[PDB]
Symmetry: C3
Amino acid sequence: TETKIESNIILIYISAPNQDEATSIAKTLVDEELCACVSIIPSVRSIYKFKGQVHDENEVMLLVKTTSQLFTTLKEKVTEIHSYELPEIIATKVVYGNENYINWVNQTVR
Amino acid sequence: SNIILIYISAPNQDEATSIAKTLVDEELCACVSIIPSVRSIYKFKGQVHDENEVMLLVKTTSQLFTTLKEKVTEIHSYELPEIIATKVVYGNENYINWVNQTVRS
Amino acid sequence: IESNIILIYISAPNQDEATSIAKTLVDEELCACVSIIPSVRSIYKFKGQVHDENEVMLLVKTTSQLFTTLKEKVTEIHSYELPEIIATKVVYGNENYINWVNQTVR
Ligand SMILES: [Cl-]
Ligand SMILES: [Cl-]
Ligand SMILES: [Cl-]
């Protein structure tokens, strides 16, 4: 059985400097119903150039599941509370999903 | 590119591995990357939870999404599993050809 | 309206090669940043048998315009004969960060 509804689901990558902040950010977004769930990937290394030098720092990655309709409200909350001056908040589109899960995300969020 | 990347969550390493090997063996995907030690945060009956999970990243073709979804729903211990796919917009040609030659049609 | 930023998954056999690949791409300005996930298991079929090997995953952030050049660099330096270089679309992001990626790449 083919899914018979469209997907309005997005998957947002948000980075954080440590597990403590990743978790407090994820619990806030869930509690305030700005997302349905978050998966936190530990122990990630971040490589980037700053003032001409290559850096290698540790980070934690959040994968946040929500609806396209909530992106802007979620983005504003994250930028309000994030310890970084310029955090990484980037959405990808869920093109296919199991129909029951698409419905669950839509019923769970605001 | 007709390639998709599917995120599937599992409650432990044993089930993550048996799911991944079934999908690979039955040619419903070309490969799976298993990320260990992931934390799942979600609200249940009004309370916020923080539980362990293991994440599968499955690489396959858009044409196989539905067949793979049905197989996963058949064998997954969860009543409502998470089977969500994103589109691969670009890839190296040799890899795209390999995925297409590996999977069932 | 959707953004021009992509996120590229690239697999590598160990942490040393993941890191040298990422530093080369960052230093040569083919990407703005890379996130490296350690300790991944790779499951695949080869000659009829299912294998389970260690791998390391790079998530590379860059612009759609750079995909082909970045791809050619990765295929030049990667130890695998057939690496995995697959892009997904960033449909939107925080504006300051989308601007930063676009200003950081060459
Ligand atoms: Cl900062
Ligand atoms: Cl359940
Ligand atoms: Cl090879």
